[PDB]
Amino acid sequence: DDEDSVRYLLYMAELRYEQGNPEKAKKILEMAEFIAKRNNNEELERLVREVKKRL
């Protein structure tokens, strides 16, 4: 239900941050946040902000 698509994007933003690319990680995070806030699941947006605490 598109929830996996947010988890996929979140993992990518961590990798791009891990590889030392801060700009791409924010962009994938912006895309992951757009979809998450348009999903009916509230845990999805909780995970997004949690990942934002890691970046």
Author numbering: 4 to 58
Sentences reproduced from the published study:
The structure is that of a small (58 residues) engineered protein, LCB2, which was developed in Baker’s laboratory as a blocking ligand of the SARS-CoV-2 spike protein. It was envisioned that solutions of mini-proteins such as LCB2 could be used in the form of a nasal spray to confer temporary protection against the coronavirus infection. While LCB2 was validated by means of biolayer interferometry experiments and tested in cell culture assays employing live virus, it has not been developed further.
We found that AlphaFold3, AlphaFold2, MultiFOLD, Rosetta, RoseTTAFold and trRosetta all produced successful MR models for this three-helix bundle 58-residue protein, while some of the older predictors failed. While the initial models showed appreciable variability (up to 0.87 Å) and differed substantially from the final coordinates (up to 1.08 Å), the structure determination process fully converged, resulting in six refined models within 0.25 Å from each other. All structures include residues from 4 to 58, with no alternative conformations; they also include from 1 to 4 glycerol molecules and between 18 and 24 water molecules. The situation with the loop 42–44 led us to suggest that its conformation in the crystallographic structure is influenced by a crystal contact. Indeed, it turns out that residue Asn43 at the center of the loop forms an intermolecular side-chain-to-backbone hydrogen bond with the amide group of residue Glu46 in the symmetry-related protein molecule. This hydrogen bond apparently leads to stretching out of the loop, thus causing the difference between the computer-generated model and the actual structure, see Fig. 1(g). Comparing the six structural solutions, we observe that a number of surface side chains have been solved with different conformations. Interestingly, for each individual structure the electron density is consistent with a single rotameric state and offers no direct evidence of conformational heterogeneity. We thus conclude that the six LCB2 structures obtained in this study can be grouped into a multiconformer ensemble, where structural variations are representative of protein’s conformational dynamics. While Rwork/Rfree of the individual structures is at best 0.208/0.240, the six-member ensemble yields significantly improved values, 0.187/0.220.
